[PDB]
Amino acid sequence: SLPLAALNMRVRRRLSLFLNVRTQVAADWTALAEEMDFEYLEIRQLETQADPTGRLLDAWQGRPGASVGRLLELLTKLGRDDVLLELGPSIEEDCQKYILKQQ
Template structure:
């Protein structure tokens, strides 16, 4: 199911990317109990929630919002397209038609690149090797992809949580002194695995004099500094970013 003015498949847009305007409108439609039309209870049942779960949602001021939050947390199949399909199956095509023009498809990325300014030359090389080759991956590079005027912390959090499948962390001595990199890494690690598990991939491209960050020590590293592995470094990284 695609937007009328776009070739983007809404089935591939995760529900977590659904904007707040649409969520509030859904609540206005579905929160009131209906004797004829399907309401939030019917939606929850169609999404596979149990009787006890649905009864517990009744105490919420916004049960529709709670259902959507829990649905996107429990299954990777929760997408904008799937939501519209469920509403259509419940014969709530009135909601689908009213909301369709409000649904803006966000730009999605294969990976958010966490880096400090002194490592930007390597980020440029990463762009050339992963975007401008047959891999055709889409990277989120803050200095290139974020428009001026946005709140740094807000837009960074949204990108990492909602619009990027993974996160590549460019590790260097300078990275260890960067407040921005520290925030981005800790935020990604703090995300609830059930909501949207983030797979962090640490990358080292030059020798370090400082200790490797302890919060990333349990993750497998892509090491560009080893001559014996440089030949397949980009292929290995591209495959990791291409996994579902």
């Protein structure tokens, strides 16, 4: 559907709080980065700078498959329903704000 420029700073910080908690067992932002067809060296470069989830979403702005619904189904494919229950209405509320800005 619509690109990830609809997601403003408040949602993109709340995704960061969940996803850059770096765990060796479960699906942190590196599992998401692998599901978005990033090379290992790209993920390893994103590990260095702070907020790697935000830089991951910035690097996944211009990619041939990127959208908001693709992000919401990749977060379901990872099984992390932690984020879709809290960022459920906020992502829709920032979708409708971007649509109203496009009028």
